[PDB]
Amino acid sequence: MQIFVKTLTGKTITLEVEPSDTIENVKAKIQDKEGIPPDQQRLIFAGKQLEDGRTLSDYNIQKESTLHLVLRLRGG
Numbered sequence: 001m002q003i004f005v006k007t008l009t010g011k012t013i014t015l016e017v018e019p020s021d022t023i024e025n026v027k028a029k030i031q032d033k034e035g036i037p038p039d040q041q042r043l044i045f046a047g048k049q050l051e052d053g054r055t056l057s058d059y060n061i062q063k064e065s066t067l068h069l070v071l072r073l074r075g076g
Helices: 024-035
Strands: 002-006 012-016 041-045 066-073
Touching: 012 024, 024 041
Parallel strands: 002 066
Antiparallel strands: 002 012, 041 066
């Protein structure tokens, strides 16, 4: 199934995923497309932060759903 990720600057990315895929796997696909490391990425769906050890089906994410990406800043 296809899903959409929106960034804080106005960008929408389209990803091909399976319901059994883990959040850590979704972050790895974003790193491949945009070069953002998984430790600096935060994913939000319906106001809830998604955990790396859970899957897309655990949060009831369905086809054409929109997730939000937030970037963290450690030091500096």
